[model samples]
Target: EDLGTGLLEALLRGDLAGAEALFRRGLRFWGPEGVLEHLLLPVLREVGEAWHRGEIGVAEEHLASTFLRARLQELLDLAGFPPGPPVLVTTPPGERHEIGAMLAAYHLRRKGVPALYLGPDTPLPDLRALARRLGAGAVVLSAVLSEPLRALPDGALKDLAPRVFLGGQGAGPEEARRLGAEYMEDLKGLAEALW
Candidate 1:
């Protein structure tokens, strides 16, 4: 709630530069956690609610979502990762909206774990292939929507790695059960359980 919805106004109105400036300025003042867990996520949820309530059009929503995701990728690039067991972070196939995916991957990297973030819409077969090739220790899949989880290929990823975790907004414990994947409710818990 302390994110202060003022810059949110500028962001919703399409003032991309202004919003970006505010984000960086806040980062300087409150550090990454403030801008991330406190600001960015709250603002994103508010934006989603605004879109759902018809306060903002899909165009504006898409604009904000895309911009924030790219900003997350920017932060991810700045992370100094160490050599460790590889973690492949991505979303199931056909799930394209992946702000949550990027956040999880960045978090894993921040935890001193080697993370191979594949972004959204990663096909299961290809992911399995790559994970096997890289000798991944874990596979983390984040789903933006629920439908993809409902139809997940059960046990398709069990041998891809020693462990497979399903997370993100739409994935629940049931999703994990259905797909034979371990359910991680949050990134922090996942990081802890894995490492």
Candidate 2:
């Protein structure tokens, strides 16, 4: 049904009802995880590209991204914090791109792996402390830009959890290894590895 184009147009045009209706259709068609992975996330990438190219301004970009994030949050809330030692999810400090982290948390929870999403710009030491405090099953960190990942202190992830995972475009094997963490390819890879 050309869902992506419909979603992109709805978002760019700031048509809230149109966007929400598409989300409903996508959820019904693809289920929660599929709707997110295939439709909303891809459309969001286009929104970002549109902004970067100056085809749209800040308002449209914010509206689209914010709407998408709210939709993701709705899914997470519906999933309702599964019980168990959670997989803590967040982006590295100063890394504000949180969609990947939120998606990973949602996918993991849907896979029966309880996940606690900590959202953006989480401080490393505090994150480590929370992981220890909760005795988290695993800790998942994400970054879309390598800058914040590079700024992390040596061994900041040490003793954080039973397993530590790094993902998003900014994370690489070498960087993960340097921080004593494992690399995750994407949300599905994350769910499979942990579940």
Candidate 3:
């Protein structure tokens, strides 16, 4: 089987070692960029999809988030966090998929934009407070699920600077519009705007 197909199969069986080994092998050619956006994100999306279908449960779903979240952070830490514009990346209240936000911070930091990642479930009020405290001119938020999008305040972050909201798998295009924040569809979109 092709490596890509094999990895997906391994992931389906909850073979953590097999799936990770594919990522480790791919790193030499694809680096973090390909691995983050392609390998890991797709797998996690599939994992989430499988959960509701009853094909997998909490253990399978948690495996991807648990592993990828740490892996991304480890990569960022080892890269020495190259610095640039000051920014904050996080998930708003009711969301917990922090890996995507961390990836954005990693990308931004690499591009010389210093990003402070607050992880997940930070309340809307705290997000505003932190943005104010940091004197951040731009606030980036990632909503990985529908609950986070649905729970957003009507005029959320309206007063803040260009508030970029990332709509992931669960939070669709409509959610982005409803949340009343500018939308960043993917990692590259977010990274590109940092300049």
Cα RMSD (angstroms) for every candidate in the order listed:
1.9, 1.5, 2.8
What local distance difference test score does each model get?
0.80, 0.86, 0.70
Each candidate structure's TM-score, on Cα atoms with residue i matched to residue i, is 0.91, 0.93, 0.81
Q: Candidate 2 on 1-195: residue-level lDDT in tens?
A: 989999989988889999999989999999987898789979998988989998999998999999999999998988866677878999888999999889888888878888999889898779888988998889888879999988877776656789999988898888888888888886788878875
lDDT by residue (tens digit), candidate 1, 1-195: 233386677777888888888778777777764578867788888889999998888888888877788778888989877786689998888788788878888888888888888878887888888888888899988887888777667765566577898888788887678788898887778778887
Best by TM-score: 2
Clashing pairs in 3: 84-112
RMSD of 2: 1.5
Query: Deviation in angstroms for 125 in model 2?
Result: 1.2
Tens digits of per-residue lDDT, candidate 3, 14-113, equal 7878877887776656787777766667766677787889987797667666766766787777654544436788887878678877887887776667
Clashing residue pair totals per candidate (backbone < 3 A)? 0, 0, 1
Q: lDDT: which is higher, 1 or 3? A: 1
Ranking by lDDT: 2, 1, 3
Error of 3 at 87 (Å): 1.0
- By lDDT, the best candidate is 2
Ranking by TM-score: 2, 1, 3
Alpha-carbon runs more than 4 Å astray in model 2: none
